[PDB]
Symmetry: D2
Subunit: 362 residues, 4 copies
C-alpha cells in the first residue's frame, strides 16, 4: 500500500528536498513542524501547488525534538514505515551559545524517536534514518575520512550528534531495529540557511552586486570543506532505508574547497575577479578591476574550536548504493548565486513599486 | 547609564512592539531569539533601518526558554535592569498537541528567568514582567474578570501560564524581587500570528477579495473576546515595571465581540456585507449582495475544551496607571484588513512581474 | 480479571500504605521506582514477606517523573486500570532550593502520565488519581478550606502542584478521562520522611530520651496544621477511583494543631512535660521536671514564604464518600513515638554487640 | 585559603570514598545530594563522627543533574576549586529501561556543570573531573584498551558517557578550562550498589552461607572485567586534578577475571568450593562437597547488547601519575564477603532479639 514517511526538520533544507522526492515517489509524507510565531514553511509552500487538482499527500504536525510526549504522539498517530530524523539545531557556531538546547534537540531527540519506535512496538515496521554528519570527524584523524575513521568532535553540536550516531547504532545492535547513520559531508543549495558560510557568501555577493550591501565579513578563510548539493544527498537518505540490512554510509564528493575559493568562485558568477591581499585577520578580498574592497575578516565569526578540513571517502557508498554526485561544485555555486540575485531583485521590485521591505541581517 | 532591557519573545508580536517602544525611550534593548533554519526576524527587521546613522542599540542573543543554561548565560552577559518574559508557545490550540513542550516553555521558562535573577544576585537590580493572560480565567467564575477573579484554566497553555503567574507571585513574596503579572486580555495587530482567529480572518478576507482564495473555514463562531491593540498593551507592560511597588494588573478594553462579529466587521471593511444562515456546524456566512459563500464551519478548529467568553475589568489599572486604550476595535480591524490587502497585493505584483510566489497555509 | 494498579512514588509514605491496601484487595500492584545507588525500598520490603507461599503480586519498574519515555514505556508495559500519581519531590523547604527539578517532577510529571493515557488510547480503561494537597491553599483565603476555596500557592512546590491540579482537571474536562484530585491535608505515620516536622520531632524526642541526642532545633513553632494518619488517607485515594463520575475531594480531619502542640504531645508520650519560655526566635522548650533545655529555634528552618495555618472542611467527602477519620491525632503521635524509640533501640542493640552504627542527620 | 571541593554523586560508592579522602586532606567538602523520601546517606554518615569535637567540614546540598538551575545555584553558592562529576545513573542494565533519564543525567549533567563554570566566570579557578568509564570501549576495538583505543558504546549509558567524555574534551579545547576524563575501569568495594554483579554475588553468597537465601541467579557468566578497588581509584581522581595540564587517563589493574571466576573466588571465602556443570543458560554452579545448587542462569539478567570483555592498559597513568593498584583482586573479594557476612549477621541479631527486619531484594 501507500508508503508513509515521517520527516523531522521538514521545514529545513534537507527536509524540503526530501519531502519533494518522497511525494514524487508516491509517499504519504508527514512532517514534524515546530510551533512558530509566524509562517515558517517557505521552503515547502510550493509543494502544495496543485493545478491538476491531483492532490498533495503532505501533512504537517506540531511537535518538538525536546518533547517526548509530542514525538510519541506523532509517531503513534502517523504509524510511519520510514522515519527521517533531519530536525536539529544544526548550526555549529550557535551550539557554543546554546550547548544544552543543542544536546537536548540533537542528541536526546534521536533517542526519543528510537525509543518511541520501541515503546510502540514498531521495531519490525519502521526504518529509521539518523542525520549524522562529517562534523563527527572534527579534528580529523585520517585524511580522507571514511566510515572507520575515529571521531573527534570539536563543538557541542558534534558532541551531541556523536551521541545520536551511537544511540542509533545501539538500537540497531541491541534491538534489531533498522536504524542507520547517513554520515553526510557538507551539502548546500539555494535553500541553505542564510548564516551558514556558503549561503552567507552568495547572498552577500548578490546584494553587493546590486548595490544594496557594502561588504562581506567572514571568519576562517582557510577552512576546507567537501561541498555537495543537497538534492543529490537526500536521495541517498532515501536509498539507505531501502536496503536489505541497515548500514552506515559516508556520503561526500571526494573534493574539498576552501572558503576563500568559494568566495572567489561565487564572485566570478557576478563578474568580480577576486584579488586577495594580506594574511590572517588582515587578509582582504578586492575586485581586481575596480580595486573595491569586497571581503574582510571579522574574528567574531571564528569558532571557539575550529574544524579546519573535511574530505570524504565515499567508496563504500559508491560500491553498495551506486553513489555518484550528479551536481558539480561549480553548478552548485551558480545556482546559489542566481537564486540570491533573484531574491534581491524581488526586493528591489517591491521597493520600486512603493512597498517597503527591510532586509534581515545576521 | 543607559537603561538595559532583556526581552524574551522579541520576534513575536508584543516583543516587536515592545522593542520599538524601548528603543524610542533610549534603552539598550536585548532580545532572546531562537535558532531558526531561516531568518525569522521580519517583525523587527525594520528596527535596524538607520538612515541618520545614529545607531540602533538592539542586540539579539540565541537561547531557548527550555534551556536553563542559555537563559542564565544571557542574563549574566546582559545584566538587564528590566526583564520582559514575552517568549512563549502562545497558541491555545497547539497547546493541546504539545502540552509538555508548552509547559516546559511557558511555565518552567518563567521560573528559569526568575531563578537566574536569584542565583546571580540581581534581586535589587532587576525588575521582572511576566506575560500573564486572560486565559487564566478560562471557564470564567466572574463576569467581568478582575484581579481577584479566581482562575480556571481550560487548556494546557492556560495551566502552564497559571504556574508562571504563581511562581512570579511566589518569587515576589518569598524573595522581595520586583516581579509582577500583566494579566492582559486578547490584543491583536497587523503583526499577529496568522493562525490566531483575528489575523486568520483578515488574511482570508483580503485574499478572498483579491480572488486568490475561495473560502474561510472557522471553528466556534460564538466565542466572545475582549480585543485591544498590542501597541497600547505593550506600553502597560513597560509602565508596570516603573512603579514604586510590584503589583499585578488586568489590562483590557472592557468590551467583548464575537468571532462572528469580527468576520462581519472585517468583511465590511473590504466591501462585503455578511449574511449568516444556518445553525451550529451547518452555519454558513454569505455575501448578502452576491450570494457567494464566504465563511463555513469546520469542526477541526474546535478546541477540546473551549473558553467561551472573556471580558476584563481594568478598573485598578485605570486608577493606578491611567490605563485607557487609545486604539479602538474598529480601528484595529481596519488596520489589519489594510495590511493584509497590501501583503496580498505585494504577492500579485511578484507574480505579475514573472516571479513565483507560493503562499503558506495553516 | 485481576485489577492492575500503577503507583508512582511507591517507595514513599503513601505509596507503601497504598500498595499494602491494594495487595490486600487482590490487585496486581506495579510501582515506579527511581534508580538509586542503594536499596531504597525499606518502606515496602515487608510486603515481600510470604510465609504461606501464597505469592505477592508486587512489581517494581525503573522510571522517573522527569522522563516521558520511561513513563510511557511503563504505562505501555503495565496497561493499568488505575494510576496513582503519588511520586513527587514532596518537601516544601527543598522546593525553594530545587524549584525547577520540583516543577519538572511535580507539575510536568502528572502531565506526562495523563498524556501517556491519551496517546496510548487508554481513556476508557484507566482512571487517574492526582496527589493534590492542602498546600494549594497556601495563604488561606477562607477558614476552613474546602473544594471551592481559591488557591494561593506559597512555595515552588505548591505552584507546581497547582499546575498538576489543573492539568488533571483539564484532561477530565477536555478528553473525558476519569481523573480526579485528592486535595489531602497533611497526613503522617511512622513511615513519614525524617525531615518533615512531625517525624523530625518524634525522632529527636526518642533519641533525646535514650540519650543519643541533646537538643531538638525547629523553625516556626506557631505553624498550624490539620494532621491525619496516612493509613486512613490512602483508603480515600483508592475510593475516589471507584466512583461513577470523577470528582475532586478535600480529605482532612477538621481539627488543626500547632507545631508547639505536637512537641508538647509527643514529649508527653516519652514522659516529658514541656514548659515553654520566651518569644519568637528566643523561645525555648524545657523539661518541666528536670529543667533541661530540649527545644530551641533555629531560623535556618524558616521557609522563605510560610504557610501559617491549614484547616480542611471535608464535608463533601463525608457526604459523598463516607469519609470519617478512624485514627486520632493522639493515637498517631503515640504510634510515631513508639516506632522511633524502637528504631533507636535497634541501633543501641547493634552497638552493644560490637557492631558500629552511625545515625544520619538532616 | 582552604581548598573547596564539590562532589556530585557523593552518596554513591566513589563519592563516599572521595569525600573521606578529601576530608583527610583538609578540604571543605561539598556534595550534591538528591532529595530522597528517606535518609540515603548510609555510605557517608560515619564521616560526621567527631569524637574530639574537631569539626567535620562536609556540606550536603539538594540538587539534581537534570536541573540546570539547581546545579548553577550550588556552583554559585559553593564556588569550588575542584568539581568531581561522579553523579550518574550508573547502572548499565537500567539504562536500557530509562535511556532518556540516563542521557539527561549522565550526558547533559556534565555539560550543565561545565557550562556553569563558564557562565560564572570560573575557568581559571575551577578544575573539573569527569567520571568517564571503560564502558566507552564497549565492543572493544583493541585488546587491551588504552587512551587511544576508539570507542564503541554498547548501551544507552555508554552512549551518554561518550557524550560527557567529549563535551569535557571540548570545553578543555575550546575554552581552556582544566577539564579531564578519568577513564576508569570497573572498581568495586563493600559500598558497591547491591545490583552490580560483584556485590550481588558477595551479598547472595553471605546470605546463602548463613542460610537466609537459597539460590543466586546470574546472567552472562562469561563476561570478563578488569576489577580494582574503589579506594585506590578515587585517589587517582583527586590526583588527575593536581597536574600541570589537564589530560585523560585510563585507570585499570591490567588483569581481567570472568563473572564465573568471581563467584568461584567469593564462594571459596565462605567455605564453598564451586563446581560448574552445564553450558549456556543450562549452566549451573554446585557446591562440590554437598552437591547443592548454588548458582543458576536467568536470561532476564542478560543485557540487550553485551560488553563481553574489558581489559585496561594504564601504562600512561603509571608513567605520568605513578599509578599502581595497592589493593589486589583477592583482597577486594575477601573484604566484600566479610562485610556482607557482617551485615547479614546484624540482621539476624535484630531478629534474634525480637526485632523484625525484612531484607530487600532486587
Ligand atoms: N547541511 C549539511 O551540510 C549537513 C551535513 C551533515 C548533516 N546535516 C544534518 O542534517 C539535518 C538537515 O540539515 P539541514 O541543512 O536541513 O538543517 P536546517 O536547514 O538547519 O534544518 C533544521 C530543521 O530542524 C528543525 N528543528 C530545529 N530544532 C528543532 C526542534 N527542537 N524540534 C523540531 N524541529 C527542530 C528546524 O525547524 P525551523 O525551520 O523551525 O528552525 C528545521 O526544520 C540536520 O540534522 C543537520 O544537522 C547537515
Ligand atoms: N497576544 C495576546 O492577545 C496575548 C494575551 C495575553 C498574553 N499573551 C502572552 O504574551 C506573550 C506575547 O504574545 P505574542 O502575541 O507576542 O505571542 P507570539 O507572537 O506567538 O510570540 C511568541 C514569542 O516567543 C518565542 N518563543 C516561543 N517558544 C520559545 C522558546 N521555547 N524559547 C524561546 N522563545 C520562544 C517566539 O519565537 P519564534 O518567532 O521563533 O516562534 C516568539 O518570539 C506570549 O507569552 C503570550 O502567550 C498574549
Ligand atoms: N504526606 C502528606 O501529608 C501529603 C499531603 C498532601 C499531598 N501529599 C502528596 O502526596 C504524595 C505522597 O506523599 P508522601 O508523603 O508519600 O511523599 P514521599 O514520602 O516524599 O514520597 C515521594 C515519592 O516520590 C518518589 N519520587 C520523587 N521524585 C521522583 C521522580 N523524579 N521520579 C519518580 N519518583 C519520584 C520518591 O522516591 P524516593 O523514595 O527515591 O525518594 C517517593 O517514592 C506526594 O506527591 C505529596 O506531595 C502529601
Ligand atoms: N563503579 C565503577 O566501576 C565505575 C567505573 C567507571 C565509571 N564509573 C562512574 O563513576 C561514577 C561513580 O560510580 P559509583 O559506583 O559511585 O556509582 P553509584 O554508586 O551508582 O553513585 C551514583 C551517584 O550519583 C547520584 N545521582 C544519580 N542520579 C543523579 C541525579 N540525577 N542528580 C544528582 N545525583 C544523581 C546517586 O544518588 P543516590 O544515592 O540518590 O542514588 C549517587 O550518589 C558514576 O558516574 C559511574 O557511572 C563507575
Ligand atoms: C557538516 C556540517 O556543516 C554545517 O556546519 P557549520 O556550521 O560548520 O558550517 P558552515 O558552512 O556555517 O561553516 C563551514 C566553515 O566555514 C567557516 N566560516 C568562515 N567564515 C564564516 C562565516 O562568516 N560564517 C560561517 N557560518 N562559517 C564561516 C567556519 O569556520 C567553518 O569551518 C552544518 O550544516 C552542520 O549541521 C553539519 O553537520
Ligand atoms: C488571551 C490569549 O489569546 C490567544 O489565545 P487563543 O488561542 O484562544 O486565541 P485565538 O484568537 O486563536 O482564538 C480565540 C477564540 O476564537 C475561536 N476560534 C473560532 N474559530 C477559530 C479558528 O479557526 N482559529 C482560531 N485560532 N480560533 C478560532 C477559538 O475557539 C477561541 O475561543 C493567544 O494570544 C494566547 O497567547 C493568549 O493568552
Ligand atoms: C501538605 C503538605 O505537607 C507537607 O508539607 P511541608 O513541607 O509544609 O510539611 P512539614 O511537616 O515539613 O512542615 C509543616 C510546618 O512545620 C513548620 N516547621 C517548623 N519547624 C520545622 C522544621 O524543623 N522542619 C520542618 N520540615 N518544618 C518545620 C514548617 O514551617 C511548616 O509550616 C508535605 O507532605 C507536602 O508534600 C504536602 O503537600
Ligand atoms: C565500568 C562500568 O561498570 C558498571 O557497569 P555494569 O552495569 O556493566 O556492571 P555490572 O557489575 O552490573 O556487570 C558487569 C558484567 O556482569 C554481567 N552480569 C552477569 N550476570 C549479572 C547479573 O545478574 N547482574 C549484573 N549486574 N551483571 C551481571 C553483565 O552482563 C556485565 O557484562 C557500572 O559501575 C558502570 O557505571 C561503569 O561505567
Amino acid at each position: 500500500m501507500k508508503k508513509v514517511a515521517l520527516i523531522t526538520g521538514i521545514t529545513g533544507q534537507d527536509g524540503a528536498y526530501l519531502a519533494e522526492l518522497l511525494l514524487q515517489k508516491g509517499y504519504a509524507v508527514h512532517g514534524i513542524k515546530r510551533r512558530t510565531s509566524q509562517f515558517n514553511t517557505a521552503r515547502i509552500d510550493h509543494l502544495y501547488h496543485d493545478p491538476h487538482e491531483q492532490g498533495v499527500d503532505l501533512t504537517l504536525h506540531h511537535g518538538d525534538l525536546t518533547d517526548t510526549s509530542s514525538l510519541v504522539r506523532i509517531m503513534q498517530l502517523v504509524r510511519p514505515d520510514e522515519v527521517y530524523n533531519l530536525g536539529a539545531q544544526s548550526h555549529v557556531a550557535v551550539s557554543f551559545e546554546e550547548p544544552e538546547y543543542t544536546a537536548n534537540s540533537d542528541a536526546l531527540g534521536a533517542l526519543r524517536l528510537l525509543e518511541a519506535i520501541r515503546i510502540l512496538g514498531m521495531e519490525k515496521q519502521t526504518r529509521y534514518y539518523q542525520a549524522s554528519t562529517s562534523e563527527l570527524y572534527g579534528l580529523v584523524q585520517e585524511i580522507p575520512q571514511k566510515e572507520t575513521t575515529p571521531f573527534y568532535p570539536r563543538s557541542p553540536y558534534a558532541a551531541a550528534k556523536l551521541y545520536a550516531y551511537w544511540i542509533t547504532v545501539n538500537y540497531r545492535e541491541a534491538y534489531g531495529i533498522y536504524a542507520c547513520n547517513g554520515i553526510l559531508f557538507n551539502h548546500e543549495s539555494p535553500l541553505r540557511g542564510e548564516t551558514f558560510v556558503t549561503r552567507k557568501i552568495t547572498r552577500a555577493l548578490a546584494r553587493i552586486k546590486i548595490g544594496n550591501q557594502n561588504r562581506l565579513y567572514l571568519g576562517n578563510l582557510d577552512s576546507l570543506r567537501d561541498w555537495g548539493h543537497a538534492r543529490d544527498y537526500v536521495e541517498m537518505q532515501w536509498l539507505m532505508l531501502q536496503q536489505d540490512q541497515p548500514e552506515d554510509f559516508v556520503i561526500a564528493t571526494g573534493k574539498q574547497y576552501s572558503v576563500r575559493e568559494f568566495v572567489t568562485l561565487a564572485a566570478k558568477d557576478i563578474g568580480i575577479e577576486m584579488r586577495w591581499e594580506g594574511s590572517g585577520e588582515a587578509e582582504k578580498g578586492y575586485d581586481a578591476k575596480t580595486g573595491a574592497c569586497i571581503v574582510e575578516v571579522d574574528p567574531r565569526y571564528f569558532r571557539p574550536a575550529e574544524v579546519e578540513t573535511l574530505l570524504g571517502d565515499a567508496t563504500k557508498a559508491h560500491q553498495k548504493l551506486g553513489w555518484k554526485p550528479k551536481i558539480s561544485f561549480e553548478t552548485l555555486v551558480s545556482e546559489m548565486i542566481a537564486e540570491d540575485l533573484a531574491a534581491a531583485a524581488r526586493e528591489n521590485l517591491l521597493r520600486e513599486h512603493g512597498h517597503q521591505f527591510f532586509a534581515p541581517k545576521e
